[PDB]
């Protein structure tokens, strides 16, 4: 298996050796076979576990793991297949504080909470989560779905 | 011999008709081997008006 360790350009290589530096301190055997330095993206060979994750959380904070979720790398199916499953589940009833799943524009493959519900303008200011933060953007009743 | 033909229901070859066994590419060749005699004019346009359960002869 291969897990993509996201690191920061300039010290991105530094992270790849800082893997191998801290590997010897927490040492036993196995886990890390062949550390690849391809370059914000450092591809690292690993089987899933609790070890080495604690190490990353002990020495941050620029970037973490890549794939689908940060705890457990690395899947491939994001949110469009989730947008197909929402069709069987189904509302145009949107209010402040309800989850409003986006699937149109550059905000596709991403979810969000609606901030502003306009009935006159026919828009939903849906806040999409990007870069460990938020992005509030107006997307139509159709450009989104109720979660 | 046969040269130019306009299908009623088909524009381009490489397709399959609704309710016929023989494909167009097959039928193209069936038309090639057909024999014609002309006395009166030079070039003529003719029509094959046919319908029903039955085998396509040649006269009709």
């Amino acid at each position: 298996r291969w897990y993509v360790v996201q690191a920061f350009s300039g010290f991105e290589g530094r992270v790849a050796t800082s893997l191998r530096e801290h590997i010897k301190l927490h040492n036993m055997e196995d886990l890390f076979g062949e550390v690849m330095v391809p370059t914000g993206y450092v591809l690292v060979q690993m089987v899933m576990n609790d070890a080495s994750w604690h190490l990353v959380r002990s020495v941050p904070r620029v970037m973490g793991f890549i794939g689908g979720t940060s705890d457990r790398p690395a899947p491939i199916s994001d949110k469009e297949v989730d947008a197909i499953m929402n069709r069987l589940q189904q509302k145009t009833l949107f209010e402040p504080g309800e989850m409003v799943r986006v699937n149109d524009g550059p905000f596709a493959d991403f979810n969000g909470v609606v901030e502003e519900v306009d009935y006159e303008k026919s828009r939903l200011k849906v806040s999409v989560s990007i870069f460990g933060r938020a992005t509030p953007v107006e997307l139509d009743f159709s450009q989104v779905e109720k979660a | 011999a046969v040269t130019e033909v306009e299908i009623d229901g088909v524009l381009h070859e490489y397709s399959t008709k609704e309710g016929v066994q023989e494909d167009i590419l097959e039928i193209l060749l069936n038309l090639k081997g057909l024999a014609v005699r002309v006395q009166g004019k030079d070039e003529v346009i003719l029509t094959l008006n046919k319908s029903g359960i039955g085998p396509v002869t040649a006269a009709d």
Partner: protein, 50 residues
């Protein structure tokens, strides 16, 4: 600038004066179309033919 409000009707289409290409028929190769098939991503809209 003004020039963009003065470019939106020579190219009376899109929001801006921008259009290029994708891919084409190769030079030398010549043939006939039979049946075309369309695969557009679920999320964004399709054409008349799709």
């Amino acid at each position: 600038t003004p020039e963009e409000k003065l470019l939106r009707a020579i190219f009376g289409e899109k929001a801006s004066d921008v259009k290029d290409s994708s891919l084409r028929v190769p030079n030398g190769v010549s043939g006939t179309v039979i049946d075309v098939q369309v695969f557009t991503r679920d999320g964004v809209e399709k054409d008349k033919r799709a």
